[PDB]
A paper describes a structure:
Aspartate ammonia lyases catalyze the reversible amination of fumarate to l-aspartate. One of the serines acts as a general base in the deamination reaction by abstracting a proton from the Cβ atom of the substrate, forming an enolate anion intermediate. For this, the SS-loop changes from an open conformation in the absence of substrate to a closed conformation that covers the active site in the presence of substrate.
The resulting three variants equipped with the AspB-A1 pocket were well expressed and performed better in β-alanine synthesis than the corresponding variants with the A5 pockets. These results identified the variants BbAsp-A1+A424E, CcAsp-A1+A424S+I431T, and StAsp-A1+S421E as the best enzymes for β-alanine synthesis. For the sake of brevity, they were renamed BbAsp-5x, CcAsp-6x, and StAsp-5x, respectively. To rationalize the effect of mutations that allowed for β-alanine synthesis, crystal structures of variants AspB-6x and CcAsp-6x were determined to 1.9 and 3.1 Å resolution, respectively. While the wild-type AspB crystal structure contains both open and closed SS-loops, unliganded AspB-6x and CcAsp-6x adopted the typical closed conformation observed previously only in the liganded active sites of wild-type AspB. Importantly, the C2 carbon of acrylate is located in close proximity to Ser318-OH (Ser320 in CcAsp-6x), at a distance of ∼3 Å, which is suitable for its deprotonation during the reaction that results in the formation of β-alanine. In the CcAsp-6x variant, the SS-loop adopts a slightly different conformation as in AspB-6x, allowing the active site residues, including the catalytic serine, to more closely approach the substrate. This subtle difference in the SS-loop conformation may perhaps be related to the higher activity of the CcAsp-6x variant. A similar destabilizing effect on the open SS-loop conformation can be rationalized for the A424S and I431T mutations in CcAsp-6x. The latter was generated by the transplantation of activity-enhancing mutations into a homologous aspartase discovered after genome mining.
Author numbering:
A (entry chain B), C (entry chain B): 5 to 461
B (entry chain A), D (entry chain A): 5 to 466
The structure:
């Protein structure tokens, strides 16, 4: 077992632990969710401390002795080694200092090991002065967040690009199938199933464009802002360097933000991304609700489509297939939305030079992106691609629908057709037979006028 | 065009206008929605200034010649006269001072008229010193709000009490009608339409109880808190009196809040009411969505019920009758909810001794209660009461339904019924006719097992 | 008094009223808020019915007799005449049919008058068959909404462009004033007031760009979609015409949307705009909260700035100036946000070929835009432009702040300065005198190192 | 790697695993958050399956040899053994069937072990037929949730009861300390720090009462509703028993809900609790924001109080101690609220006889209650109890404060004090020293008028 000390006092650290006291304080201070910070944040945090070491060696302020040990340790965390040592709670006080410190304390103790030394020999490698040199919480943490968010969004757009492709196929596959369009859930006018799926396809096209764009503002990073944006204690040479390194390390077209005070106090890049995602899920939640409708049944329901069975839907009803893949999408949407409200609240709570609510914000932000990526992947494969149509059921609905009379409207007028249609719904007779009862159009005119393939117009 | 002044400068007031400069400033300062403050708040504001005058006369500090003129003017605003004059915007800066002052400047100029003077002759009847004596914005405005909110809530509960009665009838009416219960929209086991409507009836019973309770905290009023809650420069005798009067005037069992600092800085009474309403509308929005489904018609949908036509549903489709009464309920719910978020935000934004966001809060609060009361009234009368069943459509679904096999399960055993169920799904034949094809059960027996009542009670249908 | 009839029955219309029965039904059916539909929607509705008349004459299906009377009536409503006759409730059932009908019934009865005839002579001019020809609720109403929303957004961006200009001046004006940056509300490091106002200026720059972009999707309009998107009962010639007219009439670069089924069932254009606005107000609500802080006082408070007095702030405290212009901005933000939640809910509730919740949606959407435009206009003039600084109070804060020791950190190290800073806060002595007590830097090194104008970095 | 099958096909289960195929499917189907379902739900799930076994033995329909093995396995999960095995994702399709089945497949395979068999030997102990007898997803899962929610709420109220005690002490401690009340952040009239803390104390008192009440509706449980609420194929004797057992097992005064259709389709019990919590956190988030203000320090801010340092506040600024305990409260509030929106959305999305969104609902609900209980515990101990006052800083603000003129107003009159107040603002001198400069009041008199207690009670400070 180790022992370490701080203003507050002395603390017993497990000897296996690469994490230090400031992390131990925060695990005691903020036992809130007991989740762990997103994996992709840890990776990003390591990329930053590395670029920071690299830059501090380039400006001959950090000894290459220490910096290379740090760089070595970073590279391992980047590779995915020491994640289990990041143990602070995503929901935490101190504006994300206890996250920054968790990285500082782990990268140090593992740079020690790599110098052959032992953990807690902070003398050789110092969390504050060496790992975190030229840096504050207030530039490292967000710069990480920016890179994390970007990586996840890029995963998202891949998954969505695939999802769009999936819907697009079903557009083509179902293009020739005729069905009843519904409006207020009331039977309206003929439409082809495939036109509905094109509709889905295009809203998704748009979601992709909006989420793509949300990234633009993230490419700007506040590195070398230090405390407030003033960039005190940072050498412009370090600032120029640490960015180029971050650009190389990350593989992202990052750029120093033109105003550092601005990029340090404003959280609008995040609210913007969340906003784009919320929109996305509103759309998808709807499309989900549609599929669940059309798949209602299989007898006392619309029964226009069928979705791949993925599990026994019920515990007591034999032969129960529930639309569970859509359902999960619905539920995800409810998350993302609720998360947006958290994000927004947090974004607003900012005061003067710093927003201290960044943690819960980022927790929800990153969560939102991940959840969607997962939901979409499973939904693309397990449900969407496997959707099948009941054309005979769908054609039947057309053949027994008053609503076809919307085609006889420009010859007979809305008033003469409204009365024929009110009579047909009540008596339950075909529209054709009530047009021959009133003798309002001829039979050879009805064969033409009341022909279902009027969707194309 | 009369001229008035305050420590900022001078303004031209129309001479017709009973409202003063501080109101003019606010109409310039906050031209935001250009709505007018709720009618029921104006009434309440007048009730308060009246109780305040009455109390200030009773403690021999306001001259009876001025107070009675004020009381007279209040009584008219209560009766519904001078509402046109209230012209400040519900969304406004200043924590609701510009509302308080719009009541002060109108009650004064009309108490003037009533004592034979002319408007603007403030020397005699003073907005600040007389109308608003023993009072701050921070006690008059909320105390009004509390009375307003209570009156509207009481209208609401009457409307809902009536709505629950409406649903309850449809529970009884539809009690014998059998249909397919749905689960994930998939066909499950039989249920009677009336059981669904009892479900609606009871959630509403509960909504009523929650909204009823939300009122408790409103009965406490902070009158005589003055600026901050310390109650400084206000006489306990005035505080005791002004409450007593407000109780008589309003009709409500109001009580001075035990802690005035508390009742002046905390807005939790309001967030509490909103909360109760949000819950209410979640439930109703659901019930609405149900009805819209069950009325999916005319042919390509469930078609289990029909809701009264109230208008031509569509402009181009002949014969379209839409569930527009339910639809409006859905839309209201979305408001109430969004409003709760506004309310909550505003309630949280409080700092130290005062919450300055009370206006938008109250705007949304009062709006929510009103729009609900209205939505419910119209929905009760023009939809719920007029709902009818398609019992032959509903019974048909049962008769051609696989899930019915759960009811004849204990008399055939799981093995023999697993095969009858797999056969009925494939062939698509009724399970009754597959029970006498196999001749596992008698016709009389099947009458008793596939009884509307028997398939839908706890027990084994035997 | 007039009398009119429909399936439901006979109705007594005031004789003065240009509105018909279908409007009377809806005023009875939906006595919800008793507001009136936005003025700018009425204007838009008229622009549409006009383009529709014009197009129906061009395709020689509407008699020029009737159409020109309609066009005449439209032109007056456009000019702002008959607004008082639009009396249906913004929150209403029927997906916005009762709005469409209110226009139909007013434009007809006023086209009658302009033919010398009398109201209720629907025989001459028919609400359904003539005013509303080639049209459904489901294309007229949204196409209007699209034009309304665009006009209001354009007003908004003007107002905001002006607001940005206002902040930008204060950036320059306050550039030389030094103050204490605060972080978690704790005193941190020097910053210039003007850097704070640049921060405000740039977040606003960004808001403008996002709101500008939100418009793109609105330019696409679904005109000639009719019921469902299929475009049944609409002649492609009418479709081509009615757009070009709408483009000319409106003055907007409108375009027929590539898919009509898509633009008829998806409400993502609206959720997108709301989203952009919500973000905007999060930012502004913050900036507002900042100003109210810095203007706290005037004695027991920060007292770094002063805002124009705009009214007696209090009823009993003499000499009370409250930051009421900022406060109203805060309150507006709370609206816009809550409205976004309404909009989103409504947008999601869509089912199959139509979203029937469009009304409350549009009510909140249009409201949001208007409220902001108003709030911003008043806030730009009445508060922002008049903001004044208390430099002597702000300089004083610098001169008595431990936080200046962040500048002596790279020479002394974080550990030696953390102890000097913990001692100075407790004892309340200057940092200089505790650096000469420890003799850790010379006096000529402190004159340089602890010099406040380190913000520039 | 054992092999299992159901009507979809075959799967390879690790042999270590007590979980079955239906759980494996769901872990594949719903790899969403990769969180695990709350611990307290697992406990509850086990309590239910136990009461269910017990009841099915008591009604002579489950063999005692299987039931006791089940009961044994439940008791272990209750005791906290087999939680590792619960592996389905809180956010999942299927309305919480995959949770029910994860309990069924684990309790079975471990009841097997306990009757000497091997896992996968379902013949003997069957997930569906035995573990889940007399039960559907739609009664077991919610009944669990109800018990879970109750247990966490009871932890919450203990924590809050303690929190209110904490604030209440600071009310007493700080009762004599005078400071400037603020209004719109502008200086107003004197108030005592302790009055502010009593305000906090009482809002919390009220939060407790609201959360207490939210529980009432949870005590009603839908056990024996089976699929839809009709309760078909479940024996009233089982229903009477299984409740009785759940009451003993859980400790809670549970009761069979009068209407089972109602308690099966309505989710208003949950929206009600969330609502109460949201209100709570609005209040706390405010109180938090207050404390952060008053602790704005060290020099360039209010500096009226100090909160216990709990960590180095900053990484680059030496000496930075931040109000991190309050900050965490703020952040929690934002969660709870956002979660309420998720909950509400989900509650509304219900259709007809079942709400299939119950999982995300419950995930957020349970999360909200937990994170609150934790936030409060740590905030009570590491912040509230350790708060200290800067009474000389606070008294100084009073002594150099214009608003103090409201207190010496009745003894000088409005005319003479209007001029002393305009002079004190300009010159910046204390109003006490301007009262003896003009010699309008004696020093002894000023002691009594500018008394901490006198400036802050109802009355006239004389």
């Amino acid at each position: 077992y180790r022992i370490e000390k701080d203003f507050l006092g002395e603390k017993k650290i497990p000897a296996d632990a690469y994490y230090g006291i400031q992390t131990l304080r925060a695990t005691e201070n903020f036992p809130i969710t007991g989740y762990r910070i997103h994996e992709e944040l840890i990776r990003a945090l390591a990329m930053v401390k590395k670029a920071a070491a690299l830059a501090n060696m380039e400006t001959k302020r950090l000894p290459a002795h220490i910096g290379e040990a740090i760089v070595a340790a970073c590279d391992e965390i980047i590779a995915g080694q020491w994640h289990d040592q990041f143990i602070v709670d995503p929901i935490q006080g101190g504006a994300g200092t206890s996250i920054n410190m968790n990285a500082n304390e782990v990268i140090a103790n593992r740079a020690l090991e790599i110098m052959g030394k032992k953990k807690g020999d902070y003398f050789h490698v110092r969390p504050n002065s060496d790992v975190n040199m030229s840096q504050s919480t207030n530039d490292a943490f967000p710069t990480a967040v920016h890179i994390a968010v970007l990586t996840l969004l890029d995963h998202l757009l891949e998954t969505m690009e695939r999802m769009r492709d999936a819907f697009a196929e079903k557009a083509k596959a179902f293009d020739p199938y005729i069905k009843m369009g519904r409006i207020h859930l009331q039977d309206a006018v003929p439409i082809r199933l495939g036109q509905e799926f094109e509709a889905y396809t295009r809203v998704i096209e748009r979601d992709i464009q909006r989420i793509k764009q949300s990234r633009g503002h993230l490419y700007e990073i506040n590195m070398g802002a230090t405390a407030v944006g003033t960039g005190l204690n940072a050498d412009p040479r370090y600032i120029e360097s640490v960015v180029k390194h971050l650009r190389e390390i990350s593989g992202y077209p990052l750029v120093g933000a033109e105003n550092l005070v601005d990029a340090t106090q404003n959280t609008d890049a995040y609210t913007e991304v969340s906003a784009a995602l919320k929109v996305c899920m509103m759309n998808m939640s709807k499309i989900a609700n549609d599929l669940r409708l059309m798949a209602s049944g299989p007898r006392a329901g619309l029964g226009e489509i069928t979705l791949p069975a993925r599990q026994p839907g019920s515990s007591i009803i034999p032969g129960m297939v529930c639309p569970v893949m859509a359902e999960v999408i619905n539920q995800i949407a409810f998350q993302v939305i609720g998360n947006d409200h958290t994000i927004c609240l947090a974004s607003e709570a900012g005061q003067l030079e710093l927003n201290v609510m960044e943690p819960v914000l980022v927790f929800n932000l990153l969560q939102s992106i991940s959840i969607m990526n997962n939901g979409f992947r499973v939904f693309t494969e397990y449900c969407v691609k496997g959707i099948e149509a009941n054309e005979e059921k769908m054609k039947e609905y057309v053949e027994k629908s008053v609503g076809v009379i919307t085609a006889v409207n420009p010859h007979i007028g809305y008033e003469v057709a409204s009365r024929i249609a009110r009579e047909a719904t009540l008596t339950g007779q075909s529209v054709r037979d009530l047009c021959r009862k009133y003798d309002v159009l001829s039979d050879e005119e009805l064969d033409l006028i009341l022909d279902p393939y009027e969707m194309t117009h």
